[PDB]
Design an enzyme around this catalytic site. Structure first.
Site, PDB file in Angstrom:
ATOM      1  N   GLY A  74       0.763  -1.248   0.000  1.00 38.82           N
ATOM      2  CA  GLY A  74       0.000   0.000   0.000  1.00 38.82           C
ATOM      3  C   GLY A  74       0.792   1.295   0.000  1.00 38.82           C
ATOM      4  O   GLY A  74       0.277   2.334  -0.417  1.00 38.82           O
ATOM      5  N   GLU A 115      -0.741  -1.895  -5.617  1.00 41.98           N
ATOM      6  CA  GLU A 115      -1.963  -1.268  -5.140  1.00 41.98           C
ATOM      7  C   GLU A 115      -1.924   0.244  -5.378  1.00 41.98           C
ATOM      8  O   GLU A 115      -1.540   0.996  -4.482  1.00 41.98           O
ATOM      9  CB  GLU A 115      -2.162  -1.590  -3.651  1.00 41.98           C
ATOM     10  N   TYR A 234      -7.602  -6.708  12.103  1.00 39.44           N
ATOM     11  CA  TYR A 234      -7.552  -5.305  12.488  1.00 39.44           C
ATOM     12  C   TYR A 234      -8.891  -4.683  12.107  1.00 39.44           C
ATOM     13  O   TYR A 234      -9.685  -5.278  11.363  1.00 39.44           O
ATOM     14  CB  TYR A 234      -6.408  -4.576  11.762  1.00 39.44           C
ATOM     15  N   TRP A 326      -4.528 -10.730   6.931  1.00 40.90           N
ATOM     16  CA  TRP A 326      -3.725  -9.517   7.069  1.00 40.90           C
ATOM     17  C   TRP A 326      -4.032  -8.892   8.428  1.00 40.90           C
ATOM     18  O   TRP A 326      -5.148  -8.417   8.642  1.00 40.90           O
ATOM     19  CB  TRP A 326      -4.005  -8.480   5.971  1.00 40.90           C
TER      20      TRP A 326
END
Length: 348
Positions: A74, A115, A234, A326
């Site tokens: 990212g 990404e 998360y 993730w």
């Protein structure tokens, strides 16, 4: 073999030696970087020591675990990848260096996490890159007599991202599988004004969901057995406008200070601790298959045990290749990782 995947990065704080590799079939070491001068894959000075030991270390706890070197991510400069993919010479140097680096460090696979490509031309060039990468991987296997490196990519929930179609035929033909990023649907750093489940499996309202993502990839021609569903360890914290209004789509005022300063994110383990300390009210929403909690003007979306169990059962039942997390450090004492693995069960 089915995929029980997990991503790790150094800055997550979890020591390499403390990754419980018994709960995974494939571990992804994130991220290798693009050197834009050489158009070669490299590993940063900060990552060097851990990345070199990644495979041998995780295999001490589970000799059968396989490892990937993940690329970009990212925070990468997308334009650098667009430049690299533009020409045969820069594609070749990138491809060749990636294969060399994987072999040198003992990685069994390469995972491209671009990404995201910025234009339709970049998407087309990604397709070409994967064609050439697959050919080079197959050739290296033939010449060395070794089993071919695996090649995967982390891709958006839908095969259309930022108004751009992925090169879906090339993805289907050239990759061993795609890692579906079925998370970050909503977040206070991009959709600040209402609460939402960031990873909901179902969405009867707007069809922004993991199941709708899977369906779009299937409709685009990618086979079910090449799909691996991402699961987040998360979530995100929003500030509620009115503490009394605390369901999905509740009016909000961006990120809550209980979450990270930049994006309101919190690891699952941090959220679990917060629930205990604040006596937060928790909700499992059976319609969407997702969790949230709230206390005062704080509202947090995340995946807890029931959501993880249900997501894993759902994708197993649909005959997907597997799931990935993730990221592994976000777990609370390996709780979600164990839930996911044991829910799936036999890994082939």
């Amino acid at each position: 073999q089915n995929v029980k995947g997990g991503y790790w990065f150094k800055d997550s704080g979890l020591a390499l030696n403390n990754i419980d590799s018994t709960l995974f079939t494939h571990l992804f070491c994130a991220f290798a970087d693009l050197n834009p001068q050489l158009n070669q894959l490299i590993i940063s000075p900060e990552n060097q020591d851990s990345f070199r030991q990644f495979t041998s270390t995780v295999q001490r706890k589970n000799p059968s675990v396989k490892t990937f070197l993940s690329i970009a991510g990212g925070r990468a400069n997308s334009t650098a990848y667009g430049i690299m993919a533009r020409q045969p010479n820069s594609r070749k140097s990138f491809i060749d260096s990636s294969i060399r680096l994987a072999r040198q460090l003992g990685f069994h696979g390469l995972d491209l996490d671009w990404e995201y490509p910025l234009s339709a031309a970049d998407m087309t060039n990604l397709g070409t890159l994967l064609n050439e990468w697959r050919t080079a991987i197959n050739t290296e296997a033939r010449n060395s007599g070794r089993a071919a490196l695996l090649l995967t990519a982390a891709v958006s929930n839908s095969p259309r991202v930022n108004g751009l179609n992925y090169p879906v035929e090339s993805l289907a033909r050239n990759l061993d599988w795609i890692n579906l990023m079925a998370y970050d649907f909503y977040g206070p750093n991009w959709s600040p004004s209402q609460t939402n489940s960031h990873a909901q499996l179902f969405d009867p309202v707007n069809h922004v969901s993991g199941s709708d993502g899977i369906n779009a990839w299937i409709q685009a021609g990618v086979p079910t057995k090449k799909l691996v569903l991402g699961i987040p360890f998360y979530g995100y914290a929003w500030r509620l406008v009115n503490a009394n209004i605390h369901g999905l789509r509740a009016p909000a005022a961006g990120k809550s200070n209980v979450g990270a300063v930049d994006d309101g994110s919190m690891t699952y383990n941090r959220i679990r601790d917060y629930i205990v300390e604040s006596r937060a009210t928790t909700v499992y929403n059976a319609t969407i298959v997702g969790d949230y909690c709230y206390s005062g003007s704080n509202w947090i979306s995340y995946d807890d045990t029931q959501t993880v169990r249900n997501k894993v059962n759902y994708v197993k039942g649909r005959g997907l290749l597997g799931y990935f997390a993730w990221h592994v450090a976000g777990d609370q004492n390996w709780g979600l990782s164990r839930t996911a693995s044991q829910t799936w069960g036999v890994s082939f």
